[PDB]
């Protein structure tokens, strides 16, 4: 073993305790039921004030809207993550930066989409995810030139390493934005897995399963969603991350797959995914495959907290709070639209 016990708390013990304290504030099942029993978004805020959220929504306008609640939840999560990052040292700082790359990959896609369609880059920043903010000024005032934007990404963005998967700036106008996003995410996931493996010890043990499931679900859902599209099998197989547990002959079989039945057959070889596929009836009124994968992801993130001396706790907390914010937004949507019947579709945590 790497004996992370002896030296982990030297630099990251305070943040380990702090992030666990933050995780203690994630809504439990009872809080979710209490919020489910609300009648109006005002009552939702009332019932939410008794939780860790407190008065995060008191300032906002009385006529609450789901967009306002979502924005406030995202702002709170961003503030907490930024506070944790500012107090983190070199290794944990790199880990948290890797966490933010996931949103930087979507933000850069937004930037290139706007630039190619000739919309001011400065006007796209408001729609970018705060956790992946491009505070660098090299990618601003680009004058709507895709080549300049690509050079800015390569020079003054941590995505330069992931943009070497592409070959040139022409690809920005050549490949579809979805293919670019998925290639960038594949490269980012592989880099993250390599980083976590290099960290080793409890970090690798508690973090490699989560990235492995991420890769496997990416493969499954890219296969399932691309059946009816022009995305060819050869180009589809390029989007499968190689970190997953499907890498030997699993990803290949998925690439050869031509129907959901074949994807289910491929998943059958792995009992942990066999159960997820079995439970995903996908017919109206029952959990879909994406919901089952969300449940498994939440389970893995929760199990990431049984280890102590590792950085996987921060990634697990970020993902768990992301799911909690999505659950609260879903409850608010069900309240606003009066669709109480599906109000139980939220994925509980703890």
């Amino acid at each position: 073993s790497f004996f992370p016990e002896l030296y982990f708390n030297v630099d990251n013990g305070y943040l380990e305790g702090l992030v666990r304290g933050l995780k203690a504030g994630v809504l439990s099942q009872a809080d979710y039921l209490n919020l489910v029993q609300c009648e109006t978004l005002e009552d939702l805020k009332l019932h939410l004030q008794s939780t860790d959220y407190g008065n995060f929504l008191a300032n906002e306008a009385s006529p609450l809207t789901v967009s306002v609640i979502d924005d406030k939840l995202k702002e709170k999560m961003v503030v907490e993550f930024r506070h944790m990052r500012n107090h983190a040292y070199e290794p944990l700082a790199s880990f948290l930066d890797f966490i933010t790359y996931s949103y930087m990959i979507d933000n850069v896609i937004l930037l290139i989409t706007g630039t190619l369609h000739q919309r001011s880059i400065a006007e796209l920043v408001p729609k970018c995810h705060p956790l992946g903010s491009f505070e660098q000024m090299e990618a601003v005032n680009i004058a709507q030139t895709p080549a300049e934007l690509y050079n800015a990404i390569l020079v003054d963005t941590p995505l330069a390493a992931f943009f070497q998967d592409c070959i040139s700036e022409q690809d920005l106008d050549e490949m579809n934005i979805e293919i670019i996003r998925n290639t960038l995410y594949k490269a980012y996931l592989e880099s993250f897995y390599k980083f976590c493996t290099l960290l080793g010890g409890t970090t690798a043990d508690a973090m490699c399963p989560i990235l492995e499931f991420e890769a496997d679900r990416r493969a499954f859902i890219i296969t399932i969603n691309s059946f009816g599209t022009e995305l060819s099998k050869e180009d589809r197989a390029k989007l499968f991350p190689h970190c997953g547990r499907l890498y030997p002959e699993g990803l290949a079989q998925l690439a050869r797959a031509d129907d959901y039945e074949q994807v289910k057959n491929v998943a059958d070889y792995y009992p942990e995914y066999k159960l997820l596929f079995e439970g995903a009836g996908s017919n109206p009124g029952d959990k879909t495959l994406e919901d089952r994968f969300f449940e498994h992801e939440v389970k893995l993130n929760k199990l990431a907290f049984l280890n102590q001396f590792h950085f996987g706790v921060f990634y697990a907390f970020v993902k768990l709070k992301e799911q909690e914010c999505r659950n609260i937004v879903w409850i608010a949507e069900c309240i606003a639209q009066r669709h109480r019947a599906k109000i139980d579709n939220y994925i509980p945590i703890f």
Binding site: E5, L303, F305, L306, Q308, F309
Partner: protein, 150 residues
């Protein structure tokens, strides 16, 4: 008479018996405790049962102590070089066997405690494996005794 330096190896035997066995027991207890504490938030009712690995790790220390005591009681300033080497060998054997058993107990106890948090049926299995690791320390003790009494 015997050499002036003969007692050195017996002294080092006692020191090794205690130090390495203490290292093993300390690692076992630390690993098991950091697994148990992290489990308890999820499964608070298991702590007591999950204390079993810690006890096993503690037993390793006892073994060291036992042998150490022997070497610290049979060690005079004028023991033959042969007896001093025997005590050094007994001490090294018990200490390093206890170190290995403590590492194994820490790893197995942490993993099994977390699994029991996730799968109660694993409990008995864990115990078996822990015993198989604990026995290792016992083996060392046996050999140590055979060497220290001889």
């Amino acid at each position: 008479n015997n050499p002036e330096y003969s007692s050195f190896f017996g002294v080092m035997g006692a020191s090794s018996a205690m130090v390495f066995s203490a290292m093993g027991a300390a690692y076992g207890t630390a690993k098991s405790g950091t697994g148990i504490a992290a489990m308890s938030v999820m499964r608070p009712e298991l702590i007591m049962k999950s204390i079993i690995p810690v006890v096993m790790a503690g037993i390793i220390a006892i073994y060291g102590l036992v042998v150490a005591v022997l070497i610290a009681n049979s060690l005079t300033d004028g023991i033959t070089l042969y007896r001093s080497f025997l005590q050094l060998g007994a001490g090294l054997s018990v200490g390093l066997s206890g170190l290995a058993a403590g590492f194994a107990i820490g790893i197995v106890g942490d993993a099994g405690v977390r699994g029991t948090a996730q799968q109660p049926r694993l409990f008995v299995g864990m115990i078996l494996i822990l015993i198989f690791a604990e026995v290792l320390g016992l083996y060392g003790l046996i050999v140590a005794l055979i060497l220290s009494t001889k």
